[model samples]
Target: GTMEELARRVGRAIERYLNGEINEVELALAVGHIFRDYGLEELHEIVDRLLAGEISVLEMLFRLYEAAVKLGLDDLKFVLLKAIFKLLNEPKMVKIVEILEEMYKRAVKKGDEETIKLLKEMLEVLFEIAKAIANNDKEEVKKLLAKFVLLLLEMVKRAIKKGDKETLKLIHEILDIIAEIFEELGDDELAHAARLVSKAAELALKGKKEEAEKLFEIAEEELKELIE
Candidate 1:
């Protein structure tokens, strides 16, 4: 009688709970929950690959946008928007032009007319910069390269906030760019400083923050010598 009374109070049976069969309502609920989890997890892996340089940023952005929309992830969408805005201001578009063009077509297919227009503008500017470089416009090259160095520093800051190995590798790339620029300008002293920064970045990525900071201090001293 006690068992009967308890069973009566509990509406659903253990058999029903454990059973795999589902009605329409249960199916709908299960499908929605599964979709949200799958989309978010897939986007996370995509972001990882993008940071590791395995995928282009433009492609990653569009993929993230679509996933965010599908999963109703407003915060994820906001991050995507902010990253894209920062990317639009970046001066080093030479490496990403073709990927941008491909992403533009995908945007068109997705009916993202605004993104399509933005991509077109980016492509045009990138092409113009490339042509200027090819024609040996010394001043334009210098100005754009300076802008790129500034942008790279900003990107490295963002990557550090992410605090993951793949993202941290971006710091090395940033240092390499600066070092190459210094070499091009025939500033061997600054180039050597850049190499020291590169070594520090590598140490940081390898989980040797104390050692890295010491090396960074050495690099700072070297930089001060040049500046003075």
Candidate 2:
């Protein structure tokens, strides 16, 4: 009886959503609570309607993604993204790709190669999750999943020069994942950040240590120019 009552309540909320009788926040709140209250596996279904190009898709995605990630409900993220990419929203997907790249860099700095590898795996899984919806070949999809991460990460590193805010969010999100991966691996977070700087120091001296430093100074000034 309780489950049936909850279902009826959710059904009514969804109807309100479709009728435009309730605003998105109200609708999202109702759906979020109902899913929380009754453990609904209906995240994909609800998000699908929203992503059918009806309303603020980016805002909706960010809201649900933030909630799911914070709640450690990986299944919820899987459902939401699976529904989202089906819309073939290239701009949104690119944003996620860039963020993953920054996080991968953070993992490298921490010297958490294993954690980095796992993050790469998680990223590939997301790509495949999208492909699965497109009815693409399983084998080709797997390859694309792997290849896309590498390409996207490289693009993100290049993006820093542009100083884009959306790109900045991407960097922050990647850092969050990198932090999560390190914590899961039982690594020291502070030490990891420190080690990344050390690696950066070493990499800074590419052609000649002194020459590299001078060029980096020039690059830093140029970067500041872009920022201002």
Candidate 3:
């Protein structure tokens, strides 16, 4: 039975090789082959290509990620992960977020728990950095904007509920302030919500009372998500 198992693994390895599904090193290692048997030589050649700039860090990671895991090349995997982490911060690679998100999924599927955990932590930090960037770009404005936006949302809800014409007018003025905050934040959805709420107030003043109530509901529903 043991001999049959070895035969089966070797057969699968050859099939993968013939399909061009893996590199020579992966092929060799898959069937009980050791790195000492020319695998190290191939790895070194890839390293040389990497140093010569013939390959990108992402490219090198692609070539090595699966093979490194299969061969217990922990050091190589760590190096590649560190390189990827550094590249995530580069402005030129704005698409890195998508890349890392995909990588996170792949690592989860591969049962690479360490990589998955590290990726999750990095993604959280990236999100915080993005939030910080917006705040730092307009730190003082953001503080006051957040303060007034909360107050307006609360007061507007109460005014709509009470069907108070006088209070609705004040709410629209507050909505204008909310729109200004949205302008500074460049948030289309929140701006649209603010506009809808303002229109709802106008409709309320015109005696289209039930329709205005529905519009106010939709506006508040949209704004609820944008708040937290």
| TM-score for each of the candidates | 0.35, 0.29, 0.34
Q: Between candidates 2 and 3, which one is better according to lDDT?
A: 3
Give the alpha carbon lDDT tens digit for every residue of 5-104 in model 2. 6545655665575557997767766676676566655554555456454656444654555555555543345444533553454434545554555565
**Model 3 worst lDDT run, 10 consecutive residues:** 90-99
Model 1: runs farther than 4 Å from truth? 1-135, 211-228
* Model 2 lDDT, full chain set: 0.47
lDDT of each: 0.49, 0.47, 0.52
- Please write out the lDDT profile of model 1 over residues 1-228, one tens digit for every residue: 232232221112212322446443343333234334444366556556654566665555556556555665433333444344344453334224323434444545554465444443443343344445546685574444444333333343443444546434654765676677667766676677767777767777777767876776677666666654
Pairs of residues clashing in candidate 3? none
Whose lDDT is greatest here?
Answer: 3
Q: Candidate 3 at residue 165, lDDT? A: 62
Q: Indicate whether candidate 1 or candidate 2 has the larger TM-score.
A: 1
Error of 3 at 83 (Å): 49
* lDDT score, candidate 3: 0.52
lDDT of 3 by residue, 1-228 (tens): 232243344445545654679755565444334223334555555445555667754455445544555554433444434434344453322334434444544555554465454544444344344334434654443334343444455555655656456556655765665576567676677777878878877787777768877886787777666655
Report how far residue 12 has shifted in candidate 2, in Å.
Answer: 29
In angstroms, the error of model 1 at 108 is: 17
